[PDB]
């Protein structure tokens, strides 16, 4: 035994890298980190850093911040900020230009992390399994390419994450995804986002901000309400608010056929049976784990829900030394989760003392033109398996939007409790500054929190978050199944 | 006894009104709410609403929001928002114009409250005490003027709040205050705010945003560091950042003589001995309780430190039926505190079950050009009477300012724990979205929270608040009163 490296991690993921680093620094165990490429890039999108660092949270938040200005610039007019708002649109190129330079820069600190750190080592290629202790490195995903390295390790961590799901439709390959969206030469005039998940709604916002003068953004979705799995009142108020911001939402609609045109712009055949014309078309269908190529089969690693890696709560797979974290497992697909998954794994096997990642009560956010922030349970799901549930609601129009002209920017809070307990089971927020608020909310919730905590804390009185403490009288109840304002 | 009015409240304060409204609605007791005037007013500044509804938190924040846009307009350019950069300045008039129409509107919904609510009654004039059950109403503060109404009550509540503290100096009456600041006909070019308190810093920001082209805002302060009583590191970083935003701060400097000029502009004599010219000069020296005029002497209400009303923990005074809340008591000068104070008082006497306002660990905020949010103890005060105390720090440049060209806008978090306990005793924050964050933080600290509770909560990962859960290693220790790193 006594193998070449202690850990081979497939993928320099938000969690991959977190795992690798900690093992090599806090434990000195030699780590080899495999990944596809040096810096973020259009040929093969996800690089050293993660589907989050390179083509996710970083460039996303940047672009959403850029798109936010559009509203903000119009808004300041009411604040006596007079300027020529005559048909003023943004320059897409200068944004990506300055985006690339910031991401590129991040990949530069990463390279220079490996140079500085010992135990750690970056290996560029496409990693695959040979068996229990051998990781092969090839120059193509194609398993008949050149063998580049062959790494002999104690433990294997799989953090290859997730990938855009296409839809089985003629013309599919004319559609761009979250990946390609980022590196578009030019801003789309006629824009069609396709889907109802995070990426759909968030990107809907961006292109809407960065539409060239006169452009539009339609949003289509298979079902009747966007963002399945959110406070069904938050979902509605956002769909309305996207409207008021210029994004034409479209429920119970799906394309079936796509064909390219004379000037290159894309033509679309819909469910209702219409034909429309769009420069671009993006698909936010979802994300399948990236495990097709890994040959888990040849090492006996459990592959189920379209390739999701079977793991236990300590991230251990069907073999006792190979592990997987983040999107490839397909439980909770977020950056700070895989980060936690990676640190848990580090402490579990190298840290001596085990620890399991707590998936219950994780606060997350949606970065749409008005941002959403939830933590915990929906009404639907709390009344599902809880006996008596109270629902508190409160929706107010921030004092600044009377002047700004955006009287449609209703900020919204929803709290879901256990009537038997007082226990806060879910909190849902829509409006500006929500993703910040919710983060501390989830500190209270994973701590175990009761509404009799929430309201009995003195406020910070010119803010939005202070309205959490103003909720005593419930809006209505859910009695073992059905809404009611019950008695006896 | 069967006295006419159950409760007379002197002053429709944020707390006064709250207490008034509560008694009348939840307990149906007849309440009469005396106050000076109808809507927010440039002759007698406060009104039906409170010193923060009328000449505080509302008009303040609107203006701060307005001033904020200056940065945001410059910043957007780096996001491809090309415009007429050409030294365009704000229009002060259209701001106050929209400000009044928004405040003025709030008082219109207040008059309509009184018309609609039963037991409640607004009485206009300057209130005073005759004895323990008799409130007199005069048309002037002058106790020699006309007797307007004489009100017979079971209970009296003093909620007259606070007033600008002037400085005993020649030229004093040439200065404007927080009150007069709001109604200035025109935007000041040559601006001097005086002092280093909440008001000073926040208003420094506003005029700095709302300076005409070429204008400058100087800040002077008696001592050597602004904002006595905040995390001594936060204070520094803010004093720096104000510099970067264009406000020339000045320490150990104090005016001595002010004289009015030929063109109207005001001339100033300083401590260092210089002479400088300013269009305006604001004094943020503080706020003494407004109890001089009340005639407590007659009714036997205890009057001590600058007239502040002596009260017990249940807000009760020297007499068994006269109460005082808010800024007049001088315990904790905030809107949501007096609200809580009033709310508790209502329960204390009319609500049957007494209850005391919890002054320990109240989160508050400062609405400066970068906003501050703190809750709990300073660095110095924990090491004062706590055995062994840890300090965690973290200062990061939010990912967006790499593009916005505001590389000076450092976000800051400081957590202060009880090393023995692990208990979070104080959290301090500087940066955009701070005040929103801090609010829920304070829900954690009246709940009792540990740094273990903090970091072990999963994050919301593109945000600023999530860096609360990124703090495991202390920066340095305070062992029984000294900056230290270990025990031996
Ligand atoms: C557009 C977008 C925006 C997002 N925004 C947010 C957000 O704001 N907040 C948030 O919390 N989450 C966000 N996420 C989710 C987040 O990106 C993921 O949940 C998280 O990054 C998963 O990380 P991971 O540890 O599984 O590995 P990943 O971060 O997904 O990285 C996987 C790595 O493995 C590499 N790899 C793939 N195949 C191989 C192989 N053949 N051999 C070697 N290496 C390989 C890839 O190149 C990549 O570098 C976003 C996702 C997307 C797509
Ligand atoms: C510029 C400024 C900005 C502020 N911003 C904030 C903020 O952002 N957030 C925050 O939490 N706090 C803020 N405050 C503090 C806040 O104003 C107070 O803490 C709070 O409003 C005090 O309320 P109160 O209950 O004591 O009564 P007040 O709100 O002070 O109301 C007192 C009322 O009594 C009336 N009155 C006075 N004398 C008499 C008498 N002769 N007879 C009858 N009536 C009388 C007055 O007209 C007034 O309407 C700010 C204060 C100022 C000055
Ligand atoms: N925290 C953050 O800010 C972000 C996190 N992420 C993470 O990455 C993941 C990326 O997945 P994402 O692409 O956003 O989508 P999701 O996984 O959120 O869901 C897919 C959406 O598209 C709809 N859909 C699915 N299949 C089809 C189809 N064949 N035809 C039409 N519509 C279909 C689904 O409808 P239905 O309800 O019927 O299934 C659903 O509403 C997210 O789930 C999240 O975990 C991504 C972006 C931002
Ligand atoms: N929550 C919010 O957003 C706001 C809350 N408020 C509340 O209302 C109160 C208003 O008081 P504020 O005016 O802001 O200031 P403060 O009452 O907080 O303190 C006064 C400041 O001015 C300095 N000072 C005092 N006297 C003199 C003098 N004679 N000459 C020169 N300098 C002097 C003091 O220095 P030193 O430190 O040496 O004593 C101190 O820095 C605050 O205490 C706060 O509770 C006010 C505004 C906003
Ligand atoms: C009449 C009306 O619609 O309310 C508008 C605002 O009035 C002021 S008193 C407060 O402003 C702020 C920013 O705190 C807040 O009031 C409360 C309810 O405390 C309301 O805003 C908010 C946070 O709801
Ligand atoms: C070394 C550096 O300063 O930047 C690294 C950034 O990497 C990305 S992964 C994160 O971005 C964001 C905005 O969440 C955040 O990472 C962490 C530390 O969680 C850092 O951003 C920042 C400063 O917050
Ligand atoms: Au991220
Ligand atoms: Au207020
Ligand atoms: Cl990341
Ligand atoms: Cl208020």
Three-state SS for B12-73 is CCHHHHHHHHHHHHHCCCCEEEEECCCCCCCCCCCCCCCCCCCCCHHHHHHHHHHHHHHHHH
Please state the φ and ψ torsions of residue B102, each to the nearest 5 degrees. -90, -45
How many helices (H) and strands (E) would you count in chain B?
12, 23
Which single residue is written with the structure tokens 């079950």?
Answer: B353
Residue among A12, A19, A52 whose CB has most ligand 1 atoms within 8 A, to mutate: A52
Nearest to B413 by CA among A436, A373, A62: A436
Q: Are B460 and A364 in contact (CB under 8 A)?
A: yes
Catalytic pick from A40, A144, A408, A461? A461
- Find out whether the beta carbon of A290 lies less than 6 Å from any atom of ligand 1: yes
Residues in chain B: 488
User: Which three-class secondary structure string do you get for A221-267?
Assistant: CCCCCCCCCCCHHHHHHHHHHHHHCCEEEECCCCEEEEEECCCCCEE
Q: Are B445 and B413 in contact (CB under 8 A)?
A: no
Nearest to B9 by CA among B154, B138, B146: B154
Q: How far is the C-alpha of B364 from the C-alpha of B439, rounded, in Å?
A: 8
User: How many other β-carbons are positioned within 10 Å of the β-carbon of residue A212?
Assistant: 14
Q: How far is the C-alpha of A165 from the C-alpha of A343, rounded, in Å?
A: 28
CA–CA min distance B290, chain A (Å): 22
Experimental technique behind these coordinates: X-ray
Q: Is A201 helix (H, G, I), strand (E, B) or coil?
A: helix
C-alpha torsion angle, residues A365, A366, A371, A372 (rounded to 10): -60
Q: How far is the C-alpha of A94 from the C-alpha of A109, rounded, in Å?
A: 23
Task: Provide the CA B332 distance to its chain's centre, in angstroms.
Answer: 10
Q: How far is the C-alpha of B455 from the C-alpha of A17, rounded, in Å?
A: 19
Token readout for A410 is: 């209703």
For Cα atoms A67, A73, A74, give the angle at the middle one, nearest 5 degrees: 110
Interrupted after residues, chain B (C–N over 2.5 Å): none
Give A462: exposed, middle or buried? Use CB within 10 Å, 0-12, 13-18, 19+.
buried
Residues 6+ apart with CB under 8 A from A377: A416, A425, A426
Element (H, E) at B247: strand B247-251
| Ligand 3 atom 45: residue of nearest CA | A333
Residues 6+ apart with CB under 8 A from B136: B127, B128, B129, B130, B147, B149, B150, B151
Nearest to A364 by CA among A409, A411, A313, A428: A428
DSSP B363-406: -EEE-SSS-EEEEE--HHHHHHH-SEEEEEEEEE--TTHHHHS-
Encode B391-412: b = buried (16+ Cβ within 10 Å), e = exposed.
bbbeeeebbbbbbbebeebbbb
Q: How far is the C-alpha of B112 from the C-alpha of B107, rounded, in Å?
A: 8
Superfamily of domain covering A165-285 = FAD/NAD(P)-binding domain (3.50.50.60)
User: How many other β-carbons are positioned within 10 Å of the β-carbon of residue A42?
Assistant: 10
Q: How far is the CA of A421 from the centre of ligand 10 (A)?
A: 32
Encode A356-382: b = buried (16+ Cβ within 10 Å), e = exposed.
ebeeebbbbbbbbbbbbbbbbbbbeeb
User: How many other β-carbons are positioned within 10 Å of the β-carbon of residue A259?
Assistant: 12
Active site residues of B: 461
Element (H, E) at B296: helix B296-299
Q: How far is the C-alpha of A50 from the C-alpha of B458, rounded, in Å?
A: 18
For residue B288, CA distances in Å to A7, B162, B267, B451 come to 66, 5, 27, 38
Nearest CB partner across the interface for A439, out of B79, B340, B463: B463
Q: Nearest chain A residue to B69 by CA: give it.
A: A76
Token readout for A176 is: 């761009």
Q: How far is the C-alpha of A25 from the C-alpha of B384, rounded, in Å?
A: 37
* Most B-contacting residue of A64, A68, A75, A81 (CB-CB within 10 A), to test interface: A81
For Cα atoms A193, A196, A199, give the angle at the middle one, nearest 5 degrees: 65
Q: Which of residues 444-463 of B touch A (CB under 8 A)?
A: 444, 446-447, 449, 453-454, 456-463
Q: Are A125 and A291 in contact (CB under 8 A)?
A: no
Is residue B161 marked as binding?
A: yes
Q: How far is the C-alpha of B256 from the C-alpha of B270, rounded, in Å?
A: 6
Task: Provide the CA B373 distance to its chain's centre, in angstroms.
Answer: 12
Q: Are B1-164+286-360 and B165-285 in the same CATH fold? A: yes
Please state the φ and ψ torsions of residue B268, each to the nearest 5 degrees. -130, 135
Residue among A176, A239, A286 whose CB has most ligand 3 atoms within 8 A, to mutate: A286
Q: Are B485 and B475 in contact (CB under 8 A)?
A: no
Q: How far is the C-alpha of B64 from the C-alpha of B179, rounded, in Å?
A: 15
Nearest to A2 by CA among A20, A29, A23, A26: A29
Distance between the two ends of chain A, CA-based, in angstroms? 70
Q: How far is the C-alpha of B17 from the C-alpha of B21, rounded, in Å?
A: 6
How would you list the strands of the sheet with B247-251, edge to edge?
B247-251, B216-221, B190-194, B280-283
| Ligand 3 atom 3: residue of nearest CA | A366
Nearest to A27 by CA among A160, A121, A118: A118
- In a 13 Å sphere around the CA of A49, the CA atoms on its Cβ side amount to 27
Please state the φ and ψ torsions of residue B390, each to the nearest 5 degrees. -95, 160
Q: How far is the C-alpha of B443 from the C-alpha of A463, rounded, in Å?
A: 15
Q: How far is the C-alpha of A164 from the C-alpha of A148, rounded, in Å?
A: 27
Q: Domain limits of chain B?
A: 1-164+286-360, 165-285, 361-488
Task: Provide the CA B216 distance to its chain's centre, in angstroms.
Answer: 24
Residues 6+ apart with CB under 8 A from A202: A60, A64, A366, A367, A368
Please state the φ and ψ torsions of residue B186, each to the nearest 5 degrees. -135, 155
Encode A4-31: b = buried (16+ Cβ within 10 Å), e = exposed.
ebbbbbbbbbbbbbbbbbbbbeebebbb
Q: How far is the C-alpha of B80 from the C-alpha of B76, rounded, in Å?
A: 7
For residue B472, CA distances in Å to A465, B415, B452 come to 26, 11, 8
Q: Tell me which chain A residues have a C-beta less than 8 angstroms from the C-beta of B399.
A: 58, 61-62, 102
Token readout for B197 is: 């308190």
Cβ of residue B87 closer than 8 Å to a chain A Cβ? no
Q: Is B132 helix (H, G, I), strand (E, B) or coil?
A: coil
Q: How far is the CA of B58 from the centre of ligand 10 (A)?
A: 7
Pocket of ligand 3 (CB under 6 A): A 167, 195-199, 202, 222-223, 228, 254, 284-287, 333-334, 364-367
Cβ of residue B108 closer than 8 Å to a chain A Cβ? no
Token readout for A483 is: 């809404």
Q: How far is the C-alpha of A358 from the C-alpha of A340, rounded, in Å?
A: 9
Are B462 and A403 in contact (CB < 8 Å)? no
| Ligand 6 atom 14: residue of nearest CA | B462
Q: Which of residues 318-377 of A touch B (CB under 8 A)?
A: 334-337, 339-340, 358, 362-365, 367, 373
Interrupted after residues, chain A (C–N over 2.5 Å): none
- Find out whether the beta carbon of A264 lies less than 6 Å from any atom of ligand 5: no
Q: How far is the C-alpha of A70 from the C-alpha of A56, rounded, in Å?
A: 22
Nearest to A209 by CA among A235, A234, A191, A183: A191
Nearest ligand, measured from the Cα of B50: 2
CATH class entry, domain B1-164+286-360: alpha beta
- In a 13 Å sphere around the CA of A243, the CA atoms on its Cβ side amount to 11
Q: Which CATH number fits domain B361-488: 3.30.390.30, 3.20.20.80, 3.60.20.10, 1.10.760.10?
A: 3.30.390.30
Nearest to A228 by CA among A31, A366, A121: A366
Residue among A32, A33, A48, A50 whose CB has most ligand 1 atoms within 8 A, to mutate: A50
């Amino acid at each position: 035994m006594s193998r070449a490296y202690d850990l081979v991690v497939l993928g320099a993921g938000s969690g991959g890298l977190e795992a690798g680093w900690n093992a090599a620094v806090t434990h000195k165990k030699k780590v080899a980190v495999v990944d596809v490429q040096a810096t973020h890039g259009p040929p093969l999108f996800a690089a050293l850093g993660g589907t989050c660092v390179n083509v996710g949270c970083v460039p996303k938040k940047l672009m959403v911040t850029g798109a936010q200005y559009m509203d903000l610039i119009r808004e300041s007019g009411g604040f006596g900020w007079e300027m020529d708002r005559e048909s003023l649109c943004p320059n897409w190129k200068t944004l990506i230009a300055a985006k690339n330079k910031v991401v590129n820069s991040i990949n530069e600190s990463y390279k220079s992390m490996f140079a500085d750190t010992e135990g750690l080592s970056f290996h560029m290629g496409f990693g695959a399994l040979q068996d229990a202790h051998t990781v092969v490195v090839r120059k193509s995903e194609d398993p008949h390419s050149d063998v580049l390295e062959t790494l002999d390790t104690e433990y294997i961590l799989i953090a290859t994450g997730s990938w855009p799901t296409r839809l089985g439709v003629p013309g599919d390959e004319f559609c761009i995804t979250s990946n390609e969206a980022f590196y578009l030469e030019d801003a789309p005039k006629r824009m069609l986002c396709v889907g109802g998940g995070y990426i759909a709604v968030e990107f809907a916002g961006i292109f809407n901000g960065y539409k060239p003068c006169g452009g539009y953004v339609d949003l289509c979705y298979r079902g009747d309400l966007i963002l399945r799995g959110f406070d069904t009142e938050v979902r509605k108020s956002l769909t309305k608010q996207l409207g008021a911001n210029g994004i034409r939402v479209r429920t119970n609609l799906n394309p079936t056929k796509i064909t390219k045109n004379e000037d290159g712009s894309n033509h679309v055949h819909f469910n209702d049976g219409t034909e429309e014309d769009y420069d671009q078309v993006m698909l936010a269908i979802g994300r399948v784990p990236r495990s097709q190529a890994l040959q888990l089969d040849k090492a006996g690693v459990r592959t189920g829900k379209n390739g999701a890696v079977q793991v236990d709560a300590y991230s251990k797979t069907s073999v006792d030394n190979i592990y997987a974290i983040g999107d490839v497992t397909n439980r909770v697909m977020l950056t700070p989760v895989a980060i936690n998954e990676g640190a848990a794994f580090v402490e579990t096997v190298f840290g001596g003392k085990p620890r399991a990642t707590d998936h219950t009560k994780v606060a997350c956010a949606v970065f749409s033109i008005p941002p959403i922030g939830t933590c915990g349970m929906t009404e639907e799901e709390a009344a599902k398996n809880y006996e008596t549930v109270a629902v508190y609601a409160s929706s107010f129009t921030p004092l600044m939007h009377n002047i700004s002209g955006s009287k449609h920017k209703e900020f919204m809070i929803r709290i879901i409790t256990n009537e038997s307990n007082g226990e806060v089971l879910g909190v849902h927020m829509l409006g500006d500054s929500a993703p910040e608020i919710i983060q501390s909310v989830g500190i209270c919730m994973k701590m175990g929190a009761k509404i009799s905590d929430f309201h009995s804390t003195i406020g910070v009185h010119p803010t939005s978050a202070e309205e959490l403490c103003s909720m005593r009288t419930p809006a209505y109840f859910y009695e073992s199944g059905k809404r009611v304002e019950k008695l006896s």
